[PDB]
Amino acid sequence: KTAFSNVGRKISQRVIHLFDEKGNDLGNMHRANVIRLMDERDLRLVQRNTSTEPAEYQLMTGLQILQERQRLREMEKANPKTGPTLRKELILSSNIGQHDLDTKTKQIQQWIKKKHLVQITIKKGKNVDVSENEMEEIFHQILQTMPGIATFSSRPQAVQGGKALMCVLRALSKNEEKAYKETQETQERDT
Amino acid sequence: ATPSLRGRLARFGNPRKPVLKPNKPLILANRVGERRREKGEATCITEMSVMMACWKQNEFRDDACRKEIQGFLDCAARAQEARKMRSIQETLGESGSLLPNKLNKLLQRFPNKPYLS
Amino acid sequence: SRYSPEFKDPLIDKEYYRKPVEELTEEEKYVRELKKTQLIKAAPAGKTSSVFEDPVISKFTNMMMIGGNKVLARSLMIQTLEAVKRKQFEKYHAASAEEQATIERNPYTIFHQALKNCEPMIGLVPILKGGRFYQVPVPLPDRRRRFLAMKWMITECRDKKHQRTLMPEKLSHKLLEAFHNQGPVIKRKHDLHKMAEANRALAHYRWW
RNA sequence: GAUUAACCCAAGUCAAUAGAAGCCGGCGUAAAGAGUGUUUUAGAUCACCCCCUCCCCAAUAAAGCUAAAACUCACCUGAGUUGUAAAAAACUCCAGUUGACACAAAAUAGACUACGAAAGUGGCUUUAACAUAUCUGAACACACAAUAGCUAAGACCCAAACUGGGAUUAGAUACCCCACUAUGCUUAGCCCUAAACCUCAACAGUUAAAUCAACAAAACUGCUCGCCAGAACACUACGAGCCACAGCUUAAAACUCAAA
RNA sequence: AUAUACCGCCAUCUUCAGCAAACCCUGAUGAAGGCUACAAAGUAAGCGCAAGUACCCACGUAAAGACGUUAGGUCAAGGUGUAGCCC
Ligand SMILES: [K+]
Ligand SMILES: [K+]
Ligand SMILES: [K+]
Ligand SMILES: [K+]
Ligand SMILES: [K+]
Ligand SMILES: [K+]
Ligand SMILES: [K+]
Ligand SMILES: [Mg+2]
Ligand SMILES: [Mg+2]
Ligand SMILES: [Mg+2]
Ligand SMILES: [Mg+2]
Ligand SMILES: [Mg+2]
Ligand SMILES: [Mg+2]
Ligand SMILES: [Mg+2]
Ligand SMILES: [Mg+2]
Ligand SMILES: [Mg+2]
Ligand SMILES: [Mg+2]
Ligand SMILES: [Mg+2]
Ligand SMILES: [Mg+2]
Ligand SMILES: [Mg+2]
Ligand SMILES: [Mg+2]
Ligand SMILES: [Mg+2]
Ligand SMILES: [Mg+2]
Ligand SMILES: [Mg+2]
Ligand SMILES: [Mg+2]
Ligand SMILES: [Mg+2]
Ligand SMILES: [Mg+2]
Ligand SMILES: [Mg+2]
Ligand SMILES: [Mg+2]
Ligand SMILES: [Mg+2]
Ligand SMILES: [Mg+2]
């Protein structure tokens, strides 16, 4: 995380682009000069932007730093950003029993409702001879329990030297979800 | 004075509930524990943080921090020799009351006798 | 080793031997009567009693030696010292009488001061605490500081960035840069010091 | 399995089945001292003689009280506080100083070893108060019984099942971080369970003889009650009782094994 | 065919220092165990280590390296047990 707090007296870079408490641009200067300014004005130094090649810092009072932090948390509480998609992995066997496949199928369903990405890998069972066409049938069994909830983000693809298959599942987008409801309603009207 | 042991252990004839529940018999062994090395800690940090403070203020230019730099080197030189001095005294037992090897030879001559002969 | 543990290393120093007896202490008198009974190793074929012998340059030469080719390593060293001296004689004649006083023309003085300006005062060694290794600012022994200054100078000159420049011209140029507290070898020292400073909070992880 | 020889019994042989020999041994750890105390009818000889630890220390019930630390509020200051192997989330009417301020819990003393039947009991004060001038004895009764739990009305600092969020992981319904509830507290009734174990029953006596499987906390005697009899099935089934209704108490058998 | 019958020659721990006959003692004469040098039950042949020898030294390097461990490797070095083939 990157926090909006006083950077301190130690500035990482030698050349620092500085701004005033009122927003006035003070230009680029050495960190030593910035330290003198902080003591002269009795203000603290904050980092406004880091992406810029010349590091951009601003002088601010303790109260001002708080007011900015209050603004930011309201911006998030009101308009929360989606979090990064978490990838959940499962490694199955070709000869997996049907009770254990239902257990892991129910687990995949809970991951899709949370809008995660589920990477499902299927390996050849121990002391078992299986074809890639049979291993690929398990994916359809897993995805058949989720008719209008999940779809293939990445389709089954041999990996690990052809020993195992691997697919990625995802939750249907809002547009894809309304399409499923539409198609389902058309079938209802037909029937 | 050693704490009392009368009526402290669960035994026939002792009405009260046990005060102590030793996992090992309370009988003196014929040996003492081995000298447990003290956890190590970083030293000379005070001088190290004065040198690095000058570097921070002088753009890591050694020309301005000669006095502090030499001070840090002296602390390490003194501390480096302290490694040799302590080790020599630790083996000699100059600071120890007695060495576990020396203290165990003395107990070998007067072994605890928890049995009848 | 083909020398039994009884063999002591030779002391090659004419002054140590001509020193009068009266100046000697009772401890120094005992060491001298003792060595008369000890076995002495043959003098290595590197160091001699010459007045032009410099152990630092001899060591720097060995760190430049590839596959036991001392003749070539020595040739590069003596070619570097001549290149340093000629560059300073050129800067000397082209300068004013006032600037001339500040210009050093001895390549041995430049060589030593160039290396001393690159020695890193503090180091970073991995330290295990709580089952995790941590890089930690640590003091460096005097031997280690000298070695790193040499290894950094030789490494920089062997960098492929230099295109078709001969080693005596590369090394001569880098020594004069470091002699003036400039160049990439000094920057490498500042980087190690900056890395040590940014890991100041991790100093406690050290146990010595 | 056949074959050769041998072995046992023999007009028998011996496959199945049934019967014949059923208790003076044990109960710290192998099954077993039932969570605790107290009768009657009785039993014992440990009751007369004949004797040495009354009082006080953390029993119990009631009422009252509060020193430290919290919470909350207020003033003034700071821009951050929280979290740690390291993070994220969380809070930001937040944090620090000072003052005011509990229906919560009870440093040190305690290296003491006391009180109580056991469960339990260690802040202060006061009141009441700790059975039995032989012993054992109720699973047919009576009175109790940690924690958790139930019902009802209250209090609420802090902790905290569950639950939610953050992290970790192949997964993490966990371990790690944050928030918060039932609950822990009080009152009035229930429930009656613990590795309720000091796994060592009560009373009386001994330290000699054989000291004594092992280990543990040395070995025994008298007397009494309780309990035990291969493992597993089984803290189970059924029956019965119970304010218990997903409960507790008592508690089997069939099948199975040659061990446990 | 069988290195899972073996000899033979080896890898491996070994860049080890242990193995152990025959006795003795302790544990109530149980499986087992056996040391303290200001010594308290061990004595131990033999084997290994070591010592010696080779190379340029007494150094170093070779060589040496027991008992066992992996039914380790090799029936295809040669030999050979058992089983199998003999137009
Ligand atoms: K208290
Ligand atoms: K205490
Ligand atoms: K019980
Ligand atoms: K117990
Ligand atoms: K072999
Ligand atoms: K062979
Ligand atoms: K053969
Ligand atoms: Mg992952
Ligand atoms: Mg124990
Ligand atoms: Mg038992
Ligand atoms: Mg009892
Ligand atoms: Mg009873
Ligand atoms: Mg009674
Ligand atoms: Mg209760
Ligand atoms: Mg309650
Ligand atoms: Mg809380
Ligand atoms: Mg609550
Ligand atoms: Mg209370
Ligand atoms: Mg208890
Ligand atoms: Mg019991
Ligand atoms: Mg009784
Ligand atoms: Mg008694
Ligand atoms: Mg039974
Ligand atoms: Mg139960
Ligand atoms: Mg039941
Ligand atoms: Mg029933
Ligand atoms: Mg073999
Ligand atoms: Mg060899
Ligand atoms: Mg040898
Ligand atoms: Mg084999
Ligand atoms: Mg192998």
Tell me if C208 and B43 make a contact (CB, 8 A cut-off): yes
Task: Tell me which residue has tokens 């601010």.
Answer: A60
CA of A127, C1' of E1: distance in angstroms? 29
Alpha-carbon span A102 to A96, nearest angstrom: 10
CB A103 within 7 Å, strand D: yes
Q: Resolution, rounded to a tenth of an Å?
A: 2.9
For the beta carbon of residue B86, count every other beta carbon within 10 angstroms. 12
* Residue A83 DSSP one-character state: P
Tell me if B41 and C205 make a contact (CB, 8 A cut-off): no
CB A35 within 7 Å, strand D: no
Nearest nucleotide to B106 by CA–C1' distance? Answer: E38
Which chain B residues have a beta carbon less than 8 Å from that of C204? 41-42, 45
Of B55, B62, B63, the CB nearest to C197: B55
CB A12 within 7 Å, strand D: no
Dist. CA C198 → ligand 24 center (Å)? 61
With an 8 Å Cβ cutoff, is B54 touching chain C? no
Would you call C161 exposed, middle or buried from its count of C-beta atoms within 10 A (0-12, 13-18, 19+)? exposed
What are the DSSP E strand ranges found in chain C? Answer: 7-8, 39-40, 122-129, 132-139
Would you call C128 exposed, middle or buried from its count of C-beta atoms within 10 A (0-12, 13-18, 19+)? exposed
Side-chain-side CA neighbours of C95 within 13 Å: the count stands at 15
Phi, psi of B82 (to 5 degrees): -60, -30
Nearest nucleotide to B105 by CA–C1' distance? Answer: E36
Nearest nucleotide to A1 by CA–C1' distance? Answer: D88
Tell me if B59 and A14 make a contact (CB, 8 A cut-off): yes
Helices H / strands E in chain C, number of each = 9, 4
Angle, alpha carbons B55-C118-B75 (nearest 5°): 55
Method: cryo-EM
With a CB-CB cutoff of 8 Å, which residues 74-103 of chain A face chain B? Answer: none
b (16+ CB within 10 A) / e for C22-31? eeeeeeeeee
Which amino acid would we find at residue C82? E
Classify strands A150-159 and A164-171 as parallel, antiparallel or unpaired. antiparallel
Q: Which bases of chain D are under 7 A from a protein CB atom? A: 78-80, 85, 87-89, 92, 111-116, 119-120, 166, 169-173, 198-200, 217-219
Query: A170: closest CA among A96, A120, A98?
Result: A120
With an 8 Å Cβ cutoff, is C207 touching chain B? yes
Which chain B residues have a beta carbon less than 8 Å from that of A11? none
Alpha-carbon span C108 to C100, nearest angstrom: 18
Query: C42: closest CA among C70, C72, C8, C1?
Result: C8
3-state secondary structure of A11: coil
Closest residue of chain C to B65, computed from CA coordinates: C121
Spatial contact of C55 and C46, defined as CB atoms under 8 Å apart: no
Spatial contact of C146 and C120, defined as CB atoms under 8 Å apart: no
Spatial contact of C110 and C99, defined as CB atoms under 8 Å apart: no
